[PDB]
Amino acid sequence: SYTVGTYLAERLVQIGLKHHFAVAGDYNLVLLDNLLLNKNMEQVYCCNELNCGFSAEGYARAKGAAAAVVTYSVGALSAFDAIGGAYAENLPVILISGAPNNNDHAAGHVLHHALGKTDYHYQLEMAKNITAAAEAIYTPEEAPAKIDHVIKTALREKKPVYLEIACNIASMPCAAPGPASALFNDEASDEASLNAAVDETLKFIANRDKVAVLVGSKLRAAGAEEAAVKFTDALGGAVATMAAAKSFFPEENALYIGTSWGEVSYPGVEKTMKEADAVIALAPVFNDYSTTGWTDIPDPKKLVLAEPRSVVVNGIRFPSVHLKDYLTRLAQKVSKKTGSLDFFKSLNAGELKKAAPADPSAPLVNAEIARQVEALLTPNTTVIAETGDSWFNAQRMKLPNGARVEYEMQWGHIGWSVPAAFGYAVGAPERRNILMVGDGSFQLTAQEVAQMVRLKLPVIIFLINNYGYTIEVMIHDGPYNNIKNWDYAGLMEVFNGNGGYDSGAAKGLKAKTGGELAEAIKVALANTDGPTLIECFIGREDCTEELVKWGKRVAAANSRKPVNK
Amino acid sequence: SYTVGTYLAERLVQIGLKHHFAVAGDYNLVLLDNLLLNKNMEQVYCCNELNCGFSAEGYARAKGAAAAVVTYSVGALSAFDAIGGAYAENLPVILISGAPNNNDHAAGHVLHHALGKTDYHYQLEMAKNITAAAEAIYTPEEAPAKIDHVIKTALREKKPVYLEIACNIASMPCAAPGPASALFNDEASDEASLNAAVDETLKFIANRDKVAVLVGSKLRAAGAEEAAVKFTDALGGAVATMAAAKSFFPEENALYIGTSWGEVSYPGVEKTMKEADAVIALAPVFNDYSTTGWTDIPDPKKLVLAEPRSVVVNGIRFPSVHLKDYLTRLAQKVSKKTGSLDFFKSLNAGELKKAAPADPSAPLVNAEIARQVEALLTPNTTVIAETGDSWFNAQRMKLPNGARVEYEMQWGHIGWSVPAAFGYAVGAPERRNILMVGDGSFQLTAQEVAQMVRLKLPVIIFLINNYGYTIEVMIHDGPYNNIKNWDYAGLMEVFNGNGGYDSGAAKGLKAKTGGELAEAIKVALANTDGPTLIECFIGREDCTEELVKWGKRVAAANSRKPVNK
Amino acid sequence: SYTVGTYLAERLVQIGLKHHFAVAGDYNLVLLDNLLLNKNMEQVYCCNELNCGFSAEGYARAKGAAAAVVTYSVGALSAFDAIGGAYAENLPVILISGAPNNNDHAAGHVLHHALGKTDYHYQLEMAKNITAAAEAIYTPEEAPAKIDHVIKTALREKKPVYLEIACNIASMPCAAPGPASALFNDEASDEASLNAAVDETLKFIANRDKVAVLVGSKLRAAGAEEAAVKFTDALGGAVATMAAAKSFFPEENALYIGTSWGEVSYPGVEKTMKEADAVIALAPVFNDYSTTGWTDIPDPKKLVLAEPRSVVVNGIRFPSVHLKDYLTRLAQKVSKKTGSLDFFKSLNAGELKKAAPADPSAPLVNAEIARQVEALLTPNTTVIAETGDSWFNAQRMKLPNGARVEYEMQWGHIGWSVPAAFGYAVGAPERRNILMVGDGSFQLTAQEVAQMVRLKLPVIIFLINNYGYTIEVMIHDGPYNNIKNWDYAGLMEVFNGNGGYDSGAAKGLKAKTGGELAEAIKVALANTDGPTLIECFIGREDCTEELVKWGKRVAAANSRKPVNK
Numbered sequence A, B, C: 001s002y003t004v005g006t007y008l009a010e011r012l013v014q015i016g017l018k019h020h021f022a023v024a025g026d027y028n029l030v031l032l033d034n035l036l037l038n039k040n041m042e043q044v045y046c047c048n049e050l051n052c053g054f055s056a057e058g059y060a061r062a063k064g065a066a067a068a069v070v071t072y073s074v075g076a077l078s079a080f081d082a083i084g085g086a087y088a089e090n091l092p093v094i095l096i097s098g099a100p101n102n103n104d105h106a107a108g109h110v111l112h113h114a115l116g117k118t119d120y121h122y123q124l125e126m127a128k129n130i131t132a133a134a135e136a137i138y139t140p141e142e143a144p145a146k147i148d149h150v151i152k153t154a155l156r157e158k159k160p161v162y163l164e165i166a167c168n169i170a171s172m173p174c175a176a177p178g179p180a181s182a183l184f185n186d187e188a189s190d191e192a193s194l195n196a197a198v199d200e201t202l203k204f205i206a207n208r209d210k211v212a213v214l215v216g217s218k219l220r221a222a223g224a225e226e227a228a229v230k231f232t233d234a235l236g237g238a239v240a241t242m243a244a245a246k247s248f249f250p251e252e253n254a255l256y257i258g259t260s261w262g263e264v265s266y267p268g269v270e271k272t273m274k275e276a277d278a279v280i281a282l283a284p285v286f287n288d289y290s291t292t293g294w295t296d297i298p299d300p301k302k303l304v305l306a307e308p309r310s311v312v313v314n315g316i317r318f319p320s321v322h323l324k325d326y327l328t329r330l331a332q333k334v335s336k337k338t339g340s341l342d343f344f345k346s347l348n349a350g351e352l353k354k355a356a357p358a359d360p361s362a363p364l365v366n367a368e369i370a371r372q373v374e375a376l377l378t379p380n381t382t383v384i385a386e387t388g389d390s391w392f393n394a395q396r397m398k399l400p401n402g403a404r405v406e407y408e409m410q411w412g413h414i415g416w417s418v419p420a421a422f423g424y425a426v427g428a429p430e431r432r433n434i435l436m437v438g439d440g441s442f443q444l445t446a447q448e449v450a451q452m453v454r455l456k457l458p459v460i461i462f463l464i465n466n467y468g469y470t471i472e473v474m475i476h477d478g479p480y481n482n483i484k485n486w487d488y489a490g491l492m493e494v495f496n497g498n499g500g501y502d503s504g505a506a507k508g509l510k511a512k513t514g515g516e517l518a519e520a521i522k523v524a525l526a527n528t529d530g531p532t533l534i535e536c537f538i539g540r541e542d543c544t545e546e547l548v549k550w551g552k553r554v555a556a557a558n559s560r561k562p563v564n565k
């Protein structure tokens, strides 16, 4: 019959996982054995649990959901940072922790890996703060219901969930899992509300000429990217993407006008948004960074707020209205309103100004790195863009339809990109997978490139070596922004370990000129058997113009004085 | 006048810190500026926050207390694993997190680095589970009391504490700190209880010939190492150390009989403890690992339980009795009882059997590594011993008076030893600092060796390359015990980065024979300007005899069946 | 436009409330003002907050949902006991607490009614433990989403929820509420799972002659009472009700065999359940009391477990299958299987033995009270039966189709019945409402009878004056089971207060014989303007036979010795 462990394994396969990620520990080893019995998915190992969590986060970006398996307390507490990250970025990551033998509860027993006390609910209680569901399993009869509950919750809420499983019950028998269709069972839109939300939107824009659409970073979580284009093509108004929504709308679409991000918007976009009579915001996240230090907030009286599962429009709130349905029906009924796009064109603001190819023997500069990476973009490419100036470099790139950008702009844990790129490339090996990561960020999680070597993943890594934390320098500078430099190129042979117990096919190259970068890229593209790290040398102050302006607003928001209470 | 930040700085200097550890982030930059104004301590930077926390843990082992400064949520959640570690290992580590501008509470504001919701008490609430005190500071007037409370609590309980400081109040004025003596103010022993606990101990052993003393791993937390020797010298009974208490009792002392650890005890110790009429346990921790899978538990009827701040003896419980006072006073009143040591000697069990020097050209084996490391021990040496077979290799070493061993046996987070060794070597640069760390553990936290390079710390690192997780292999084996191999020796030149933006004086060497190891040790001893990593190659199954036996009991305890409820 | 307060008011009207319950306090007065603006519901006041919560609980039993409004901390903490009760009994009760001015967060301000510290998230965090959803509202813009989320959650989960509203935002403007239909929007059954669950049930009983149906106490929460009858009529097998499910199945139905409650079952039922080949359990709650101290637990091999939203049958678990749908579809597909009923009839066990009418001048006994109350039952009657021997007296009564019994057997808070009867009679004034409550229970919450007087509710109260806690006497006796006696009959004129500031039409009567009881019942039935309390005098040991037997098993389960861990 099924066991607690194989029940969990079958449910993971049923929701579409082809892989799950893990770090062994004595509290989870039997559970890992059970998961390995299901040959419809592979078990992938990680260096540490923070990286294991972020690897699952990256895999969920590629495949829609993911799972990570860690040991009690010492494994789960660090993995919590990555699970909070999954919560912040709306990804269904299932964290499963091994846990104490079920005889040790209420027994006055002190156990290894715990705090030295005799009670073991602290980890579960901590996990409730950063998950949508969190269940401890102490007996085998309780497992099927707790597993089904947390997996249904993760999928319908697009949030991470927690499970712990007593180490001595992982191989115990339980009931068999029913059909997979039950796991995707979710509310439909309330018919009357859906129709009323659509109707009130038509009423709201009936006498408004300039209707602009602002694409937000929960659009994919709502499963509404295709429906958005149906609507925007019907409307014919100007469409802009918020920074974190890059690649959630087609940039070669005739109505696309570029990035909306306050004073670091593409030319003409800020003025177009300001002059709109109505802004239809599709699942946006308005926080201190996306509003450019609270300087760029949508006019409340011009706003139609279409979240994933509700619409606020014309002064009325509509719960139980799914964004995909709302956009699809609105697309069928809306009239053609081109005024916002006419207005944008009338500014004659031109396209984003980009640098021409550098003299190849001149010293490398940031703009030349960005040009050559941008030239690699195809319909089959994904760029993983780390927190740092890589945010702003990636934002400036024109995406061919189908090309994807992965951003972690809400959580913003530097170092996320390395393990996230590993997990993503495991989930989508058919793609050209590019990682843009700063030197400062790289040092927090660099060891996961060794797993890329191990699984022969041809990830192209652009390591931006500007000697320190340049985005922090452009917010508020001090001696804490300085780091110890590494030979980053040389680290690839360290992870290969050729002549040691195993081998690898990673390559590490240095680029100090445009010519050296172009040559390194050719070698990277030809290396199909392992990752290629290109160490790019540029000055600390050689950064985007956008970062300089945005960093000043962030610094001011963070330090603004207390108000009188 | 003082500010919130300089108040904190002065309090940390007053409890004896010469250094604090940090990883910058926009929510803590101003706070770091304020801490830097106090020139009586240095601010040391770390690669990531899990390592920052463990670096503080290691420094508290050297100096008594420590502090780590991180950014909100993305920095604190991973640092929580290390703080839970400090709780488990009884070290006063002060975690200070930057936090949101104080205007963002109750304002409907979504902020970067948080969950996407508008409330910010989740981190504090999570921190309460793993600390002795935990205070959020939202206004400057509240800072002095919360800082004084958590620092007093940490010192008196020997436990980690938590602070968060709103980022816009770090430079705001507050009252000045009073005398340092107030921070160390603690209860004295209750005089009637102290005398009664001593008297009932005399009554309990009055007709008990064989009295053995069992030294436990909370002895240093009780500040009772020197008082323990006063008592054991007066009693003259056999003295044994639990595994995690190695170096908390002088091994050249005439009454010392070696390690007590169930069936992996030193020769004759297990039998001596079993035959004792009374066991006086000094601040023990009895858990599933220290009891060898619950197979070695002290006889309740023969036990005198002298914890740090209470004694249970002769059927009576005495709270408010401090262990240093109890031992000092009992030393003055106890009679000479040599029966247990006479019994031990009567066994003729001999000393722990150790291997003779290997043929220097033969393939390196585990026992030869342990012999050469043991030969480097002086009165000025400290050995940092990682979770893994290094636990058992270090346990076997004879310590000259003054030599120290640092263990993390309660928390047991593999990878602790790298950052802990960095922090310890910052705190105690005058000592011969040796790190024994397995390959699997090293990969969790390896980047903190670059900080050793940066501060020119001459840490001697023995990297045990047995290609995988051998201790886990000896508990329960599977494909999850296999790892990707690295060129560990070559990583030292990567962290030097000579020819790059800066430089280093680290050296990495390989040892595949006893002769190569001896040579590498000479070079390590002569390298005063950076760390020396010696990559030692041995087989997976070439491990201590003790690990094989202990691992089987641990596996059986972990998997024992549920009992009928 | 709508305000935070009138938004909440309209949502409560939309889910069907005609009344909400409240206790004034300065943190909620403006909120109460706003709620009063909606004239589609009445605001009902209570004596204290524990009674206010239980009044809402009773009202949800009558109408399906309810709301209670209290002041911060001093009002909410006692109301939490009643909210936990609503969670335990599966009732959608919405607790709304007033809360501090939104300027007092992060301001170093100490406030009245709170703990003396300067932070105010403790109440919210406590509420999360006993609710399905819990949201604090600090700004008006955040109110609509949090209100809609908690109300939808309460209805779909059939569980209580929590809201707190800053006292200075209750009259602030917010968006208007959409259609009421959105609040009832819930998942449908997964169609493949529903058909498969039905088919696997047919497969399971295919070669099983005696199929018995066991009706559980979550049948009403699943909305499946009528579907159960469709299925049982089609099957034609014996049908029994668990104790807490009394009145959730029609007792005049030809297949009904009476109460299943282990050794205190109706005659022939225990043997019939034991001999069944299959037991189909409809939404059961198996706990220490319903299993008669764990002596009566269903055979796992014979069990079909049809919960509210899942079925476990034939070794397979089916999430996403709603009980009403499962029973309706199974009713259409099942064959006639009368074997369990034939078996029951073949026992010739006879009907439950009931006492003949007493000599009317003899001293009143418990069986004569129960006979005269049972004779008052009509199709329009509800009996509210308090924890105590009234549980067992009520269980013995034959219900005419349509008559209801209300039990609080999972929470079991003595004193629940008085405020619950008040709230139920406000929600269902057309019914003949009978309260059976013991003297001990009455003393916890007696003051809510004054509200019955105030609103002129003709509740007939049988006060069972056996001088103390008889059910506790029959579990384990001591001096703690003794209470101070009151003139309970005389309390009705106290709550009238005729000749004081107002008036009342309550009547209190004493009954010491069957004749006196019959006369008091006549007066009670004729009193249409207020409650009538009949103080019935019986001996401490004059209790049901069932209580004696059940109490012994409960005492033994509670005291069973710890098992070896």
Ligand SMILES: C/C(NCc1cnc(C)nc1N)=C(/S)[C@H](O)COP(=O)(O)OP(=O)(O)O
Pocket (backbone or CB within 6 Å): A387, A388, A389, A390, A412, A413, A414, A437, A438, A439, A440, A441, A442, A464, A466, A468, A469, A470, A471, A472, A473, B023, B024, B025, B026, B049, B071, B074, B075
């Ligand atoms: C230290 C920090 N942010 C604070 C931070 C610190 N800790 C964690 C885990 N997450 C964080 N965001 C940041 S953005 C650096 O400047 C990034 O440095 P790098 O990767 O080197 O990029 P650039 O040089 O382009 O800025």
Ligand SMILES: C/C(NCc1cnc(C)nc1N)=C(/S)[C@H](O)COP(=O)(O)OP(=O)(O)O
Pocket (backbone or CB within 6 Å): A023, A024, A025, A026, A049, A071, A074, A075, B386, B387, B388, B389, B390, B412, B413, B414, B437, B438, B439, B440, B441, B442, B464, B466, B468, B469, B470, B471, B472, B473
């Ligand atoms: C994986 C794990 N323990 C589980 C574990 C996993 N995750 C964390 C953070 N802490 C833990 N203790 C352990 S003990 C390894 O076998 C250690 O490997 P290594 O350092 O390579 O040592 P040996 O080869 O001598 O055993």
Ligand SMILES: C/C(NCc1cnc(C)nc1N)=C(/S)[C@H](O)COP(=O)(O)OP(=O)(O)O
Pocket (backbone or CB within 6 Å): C386, C387, C388, C389, C390, C412, C413, C414, C437, C438, C439, C440, C441, C442, C464, C466, C468, C469, C470, C471, C472, C473
């Ligand atoms: C004290 C207690 N139960 C414990 C209890 C105590 N506190 C609360 C709030 N809830 C509880 N169930 C119980 S059942 C009494 O015997 C009830 O007394 P009474 O109402 O007088 O009934 P009977 O005499 O028929 O038993």
Ligand SMILES: [Mg+2]
Pocket (backbone or CB within 6 Å): A438, A439, A440, A441, A464, A465, A466, A467, A468, A469, A470
């Ligand atoms: Mg950098």
Ligand SMILES: [Mg+2]
Pocket (backbone or CB within 6 Å): B438, B439, B440, B441, B464, B465, B466, B467, B468, B469, B470
């Ligand atoms: Mg190893």
Ligand SMILES: [Mg+2]
Pocket (backbone or CB within 6 Å): C438, C439, C440, C441, C464, C465, C466, C467, C468, C469, C470
């Ligand atoms: Mg009574």
